[PDB]
Design a binder for this molecule. Structure first.
Ligand code: HEM
Ligand code: HEM
Ligand code: HEM
Lengths: 726, 308, 726, 83
């Protein structure tokens, strides 16, 4: 029952490209990657090699293949304590998944600021460019269960736990800069509406159903984040290629006591990139684990996800200077009005060891702040402060969830709290209360001050009556949707129109569709008309005369709201499919791989069967996957080298592979006789931008391909794809 | 008055074909379809039309749109007990999913035997062809979570709760007539091998990964059920068009105390029918809820799943 | 600083007698005491001196006196995350108490065998006289809640966790050698019957109610342990002065595979000693924590509880050599037939640091055996094997209770079990199943062998039909109760009579009393008559002629069954009340205290008030307690020295002190004018056995007193106590 | 929530209101009530927005807090009048 002779069961503990080795727990793949938090988990890491198999009480097991029975065909005996312990632990494996964001993928890394921020905040983790803060990040979808698919259309969660020297700070954000609703009291309404409908629990991972669009049509506050969801923001290529936002306005407090309003941003250093809808939806079927896999593999390859932290900063005296309320989380602050100041860089550089222990049990909370940070009255933030504490007690089984290893602070913690289910800490303090004399009052309160001080809330002025009332300043719902719409490129606008049209086609009750279209007519007539036409709906004269909402503080657009208007492409860590034949021209392949390797782009070698093929020069080429097994959905570009093209010329899967990649706007490159495939994608002989072609794969061919890949997708091909049957 | 004036928001309370009307809870879609179990659930069914919105304590709510704050732009106050109750119930909605067969779709129905089986079993539910036994049946996949896809390649579970006059009998079977392993002591081994791998929790809903095939290769007792899983049996067209089996040999005991060995079968009266692999895998993407949907809609249409 | 200047808040970290210092956490009191288990807990112990007060996330708290509010008389704000974490942890402090034995008191210690027992067992912890095994022992009552009283009449539990090098072994026993019932199936019936009745949840800590005696009257198998319960066995003086028993027959298994039947015994090295009923019951009121307190204070004083482990051993071929069935847990094995062989010694030498974390969360299981031990078919033990695993999952919150620090093995444990609520261990094994090739099949099964081998069950022959049937061999109910009765001294027999009489008086339905009396007439006529008389019941002529049950294998008694038949007193750690007056004769006191100190006997100095008094010669005498504050119930004897006897001669409390102690059969000693107190307890001028008296507290006054204390109580005084109104 | 095992402790018989209770809350451990409402959110059109909010009033009205004036700074401070 043993390992192969050749040690091929065990992956190399060295960075390797996706597919080259079986993936492995982080501490075994990258044992020399350390930080303070990863080190501190060492008390609970358990190995296995050379150890005897035992019960949980330490008793060695002789026979782990059989129950104890009276004779070998007899009844199982109740005294089999080994069987019952093993079955009981199995029987009790599951815990409640998260009520939202149950589907998520996490990794370890570190953060450091570029320069001390002491002028605007006394937060210790921002005080020194050479003081490094361990982090654990979990990225997530929102709607679906923990076993749902990665590449659904949904908002994404982006939660970062900072293990600072002055306490855990969790920054619990999303990949769009606003939320659907204004006041936390409506959260259960909204989430019930987007989640599977309660009679039949359908659909998973999708807003494309009646109840979501019903709530939307009756709650126009939702429309801004709905625009972002229906755009390609809702289908990121990778967690590495999306933006992050805290959404709410928070405060920074400096040593002088000055408060500055702040909104938090993460910039992906790999650039912004999203799938297209047909590709994203098909990919939930071909690989429901695509984003989880891609994140794990990037870290195993050395393509560490990196993000830049950035702050939009607004002085206290400028609180009311915009035509939107800063405390309204359905409103974004355009970068054109308030730029993002770069603050520091976060690098995710190691995977967990056990997904359940570290990812499933991690607990983040936006209420987890530190001195130098504070809240505001944002009525959605205010309610979140209550919710995460409450849900985690039942999800994680009691109030000692901070003792679960992943959640533990790395800085000191001491207090008079005691007991609770699964209490780990054995307190020796003779006192469990303060004030006490019997322990000289330790642990003691600490006055606030410039560093290492106790937490004190900023003394904000509160004046008003106890009311359940939405601020009048929050009652404007169309101008930000329209700013977003106007800031998208034409192809991005088309994909938005296609998102609304596809989703509303799945709404069974037609008046719900009509009411949503009426809401679109309040944002932009061109958008409303394009959706209406796809739905066979005709706008009335009144609808055509709805006056468009005002510009946002004179802005007619802000290109930072577009994924693509401003190029920010980075090809490192992207992947190319190379479609092999049984007599590959080894000169083509040499040049291809050399150029890819120079830019940090990975390759997957594909064929019509598994095993190996032999190139013209005797080189044996191992096959990663079949054309069916690793579809074009899972790669960024396709390259077909010369060789014996007749081997694959009439293979349906190989032809379809090119048709699918072509449809989904990916760069394709064809060398030598592979150019015969130009017929399948049915498109000229002078060639076309987006298809690289040459007698062979030279320097120039690869440079062209690599340039297209830096632009992510071939948008100019869009008019050509409605004709292809794929 | 948010409902459309034409009453088109509400599905007709009569059988209708898939897609013709919005789907609805069973007691509203088919109020006249009754059995003893469904009738006995009446004490806990809760309606809604014409009733005031309240807390769980019965206090009427005036404004379910806003938290209580100090000023309309001020901080939320700890005294907002309406807000806290609503968010707390929300916060605690989830329970652990089933350790296996977490993904499953269920319906109510009824069973009747063709003739009294008193000669071979004193089981009351099988004693009289005029004796009707309410059932609740759940069909499931095995490996994936409750939010995983329906048309994966997997064994299917087929569990029937018989509410008999002498006790609940649960017949907890699968859609193939054998299981992968011999002794329950190995069940955590086998299930761990098929389930997502522990470092990264991949893949969902699939035995197509190293640990499953490592275990199979080292445990040849698995091969028989593996053959079934790799065949089109692993990808049924519908829960209505697959076979059921209790797998184990049980005993029937008659009044004279004679034991007869029995294995249980379910025959789908709609026939046996499966998907093909490329279709099944793509369907997990285009509609991960396809079997759940198909079952619900068949019952709404009057195409009742029948099994012998 | 709130501590006093003089440092009197902090107990001395050295052995001190009961009452001399405040009690403290074990690791603070006795930092120098260590064993392997205590050392292994070090990583979870938490200090407090010199640390800042923080949240559980490590954020320093500035003001731990106030909620955050809008204005200092304003509403509390939801954003107060410091308040909500502190209150939430508080809100969730409790866990379910144990279904039975909820009330218990526990200490750390160590065990060592006297010699290797490798000839009869391959159990590692018994293999070497040099091998020391850490232990954790919890003693308990059975019926009452965690907050019920110690000195109730009840069975006591005695549970020992041995942290061996081959696994945790739990020896989960009682202070009597049999149980009430035969088959585990009836455990909920019996326990429901003894526990508080379900309508009104009365009575706590008492079998004196209808449902208990109803069950007993209908289930004669219970009578054996009921006899024990009604005897003074039911009210021990201290956990230090009771026997322990595993009750069931288990097996020892040697390296050759030979099985030997075994029953386990603990012998108290401090000897056997019990309270009398009126004393025990009042003491539940004056100090409901008396046993818990006494165990803790003995350990702080260095009076470490010591027990000898012993085995009754029966060869496999002698299974049917007795009049009763070895597998019947309502039968004892008389020591006259099978002697107890001494095995080793256990010393409890350290208190916990945190009662909840170490005591409340400890989980013991009679199914936790190690290779070299095995079970038998005892049908009560059989069912136990199921129950403790089940209960502990809900009590302790999931299947990883073995990771709670007190429960962890000190030896290695590795297996393929994963996940579960509150999972601490982070597994790095690429595999979570076996057989596996991807981790070379580690951790691996180990064949059984002479040492360090895997667990294999003894291949006992099983033959018969699947039946719910009691063995006919178990169907004898009276001969063990009779053996027990005949082995008791006449004063122990009287206290048994009075236990049944008092409990049956509290049974409201008269026919239930009648039915119990009829059961007694089947055991012993003298017993039945005496109880009957106290209940106003007359035996019928038929009851009067019930033939008594036969002797047990020829024995008409066994004095090892009696608490007192064979003197085994030890005065070390017993306590004496010394009743002071305002002008004590200092020569009497020096001699008293010097004599007490030499035998390890503690003293408490008592007066009509707190503070101090001054002896005839200037010596300042500090008062420990008032007569009312520390009643005679709490001491083993009373000495009254000479002095100004007039000062307390008419003190109602001081007179009553002597009356109570007289009634409860405690030695009393009176010196010089303290002899005036003879009048209050009606002692004749020439004195009586059990009252020491003289002109001064010595020559042989202290030897006489200490001699009486060695005999525990003055049994000969029993006829005299009825005429004393106390 | 922890003592009684989940968020449906109001369905424990002794705790239940004797007056009507209807809302959009769903699920939670040991859920007894089986909701037939097509909607589990409001505002909804698919159940005509039932169950519905009720304005506060002299009898049978919805709960509205008394509109007490709050003026002060966010402080963790004991009122001097309590001293
Ligand atoms: C700005 C709007 C919000 C954002 C950016 C957001 C973000 C997130 C994220 C990223 C997670 C997953 C953390 C993880 O990976 O474990 C999460 C979980 C959760 N959120 Fe929020 N959220 C928002 C609004 C709300 C609201 C209004 C509430 C309720 C008042 C709420 C309650 C919850 C709950 C109960 C969880 C599960 C937490 C756990 O089980 O540990 N969220 N949220
Ligand atoms: C012939 C072999 C088996 C068959 C046909 C089978 C069938 C099933 C089915 C259909 C379900 C889902 C019931 C539902 O819809 O809720 C289920 C659940 C489950 N099974 Fe089995 N099973 C088999 C073997 C085993 C074994 C050997 C074990 C462990 C010793 C096991 C443990 C479980 C557990 C713990 C659940 C979850 C039950 C719950 O949470 O209610 N099964 N099984
Ligand atoms: C020879 C007869 C028995 C003896 C000597 C005995 C002894 C004990 C003791 C000493 C404890 C307390 C352990 C501790 O201090 O934490 C205990 C707890 C317990 N016992 Fe037994 N017991 C007996 C019979 C039974 C039976 C027949 C059952 C059920 C079939 C049972 C079920 C339990 C349960 C559920 C607990 C609570 C365990 C926990 O919560 O950790 N016992 N027993």
């Amino acid at each position: 029952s043993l390992a192969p002779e050749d040690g091929s069961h065990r992956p190399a503990a060295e960075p390797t490209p996706p597919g080259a080795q079986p993936t492995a727990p982080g501490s075994l793949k990258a044992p020399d990657t350390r930080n303070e938090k990863l080190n501190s988990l060492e008390d609970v890491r358990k190995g296995s090699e050379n150890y005897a198999l035992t019960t949980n009480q330490g008793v060695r097991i002789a026979d782990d293949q059989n129950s104890l029975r009276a004779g070998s065909r007899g009844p199982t005996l109740l005294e089999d304590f080994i069987l019952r312990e093993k079955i009981t632990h199995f029987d009790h494996e599951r815990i409640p998944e998260r009520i939202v964001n149950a589907r998520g993928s996490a990794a370890h890394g570190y953060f450091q600021p570029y320069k001390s921020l002491s002028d605007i905040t006394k937060a210790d983790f921002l005080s020194d460019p050479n003081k490094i803060t361990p982090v654990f990040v979990r990225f997530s979808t929102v709607q679906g269960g923990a076993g749902s698919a990665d590449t659904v259309r949904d908002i994404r969660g982006f939660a970062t736990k900072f293990y600072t020297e002055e306490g855990i700070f969790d920054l619990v954000g999303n990949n769009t800069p606003i939320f659907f609703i204004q006041d936390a009291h409506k959260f259960p309404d909204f989430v019930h509406a987007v989640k599977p409908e309660p009679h039949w629990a359908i659909p998973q991972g999708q807003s494309a159903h009646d109840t979501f669009w019903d709530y939307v049509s009756l709650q126009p506050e939702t429309l801004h984040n709905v625009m972002w969801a229906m755009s390609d923001r809702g289908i990121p290529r990778s967690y590495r290629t999306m933006e992050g936002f805290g959404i709410h306005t928070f405060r920074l407090i400096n040593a002088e006591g000055k408060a500055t309003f702040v909104r938090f941003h993460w910039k992906p250093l790999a650039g912004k990139a999203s799938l297209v809808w047909d590709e994203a939806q098909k990919l939930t079927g071909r690989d429901p684990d695509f984003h989880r896999r891609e994140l794990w593999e990037a870290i195993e390859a050395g393509d560490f996800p990196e993000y830049e932290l950035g702050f939009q900063l607004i002085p206290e005296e400028d609180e009311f200077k915009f035509d939107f309320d800063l405390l309204d989380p359905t409103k974004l602050i355009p970068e054109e009005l308030v730029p993002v100041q770069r603050v520091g860089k976060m690098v995710l550089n190691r995977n967990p060891d056990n997904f359940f222990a570290e990812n499933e049990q991690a607990a983040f909370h936006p209420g987890h702040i530190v001195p130098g940070l504070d809240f505001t009255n944002d009525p959605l933030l205010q309610g979140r402060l209550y919710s995460y504490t409450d849900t985690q007690i039942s999800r994680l089984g009691g109030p000692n969830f901070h003792e679960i290893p992943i959640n533990r602070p790395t800085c000191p913690y001491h207090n008079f709290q005691r007991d609770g289910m699964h209490r780990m800490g054995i307190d020796t303090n003779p006192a469990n209360y303060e004030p006490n004399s019997i322990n000289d009052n330790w642990p003691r309160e600490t006055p606030p001050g410039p560093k290492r001080g106790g937490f004190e809330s900023y003394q904000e002025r509160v004046e008003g009556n106890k009311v359940r009332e939405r601020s009048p300043s929050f009652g404007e719902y169309y101008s930000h949707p329209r700013l977003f719409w106007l800031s998208q490129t034409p192809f991005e606008q088309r994909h938005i129109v296609d998102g609304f049209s596809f989703e509303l086609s799945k709404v069974v009750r037609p008046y719900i569709r009509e009411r949503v279209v009426d809401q679109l007519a309040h944002i932009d007539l061109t958008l409303a008309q394009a959706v209406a036409k796809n739905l066979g709906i005709e706008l009335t004269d009144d609808q055509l005369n709805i006056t468009p909402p005002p510009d946002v503080n004179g802005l007619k657009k802000d290109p930072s709201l577009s994924l693509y208007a401003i190029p920010d492409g980075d090809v490192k860590g992207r992947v190319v499919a190379i479609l092999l034949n049984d007599e590959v021209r080894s000169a083509d392949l040499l040049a291809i791989l050399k150029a890819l390797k120079a830019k940090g782009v990975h390759a997957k070698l594909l064929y019509s069967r598994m095993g190996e093929v032999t190139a013209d020069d005797g080189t044996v080429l191992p096959i990663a996957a079949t054309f069916a097994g690793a579809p074009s959905l899972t790669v960024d570009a396709v390259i077909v080298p010369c060789g014996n093209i007749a081997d694959i010329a009439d293979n349906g899967d190989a032809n379809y592979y090119l048709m699918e990649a072509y449809k989904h706007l990916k760069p394709i490159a064809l060398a030598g006789d592979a150019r015969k495939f130009k017929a399948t994608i049915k498109i000229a002989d002078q060639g076309e931008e987006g298809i690289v072609e040459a007698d062979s794969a030279d320097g120039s061919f690869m440079d062209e391909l690599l340039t297209l890949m830096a632009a992510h997708r071939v948008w100019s091909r869009i008019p050509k794809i409605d004709k292809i049957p794929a």
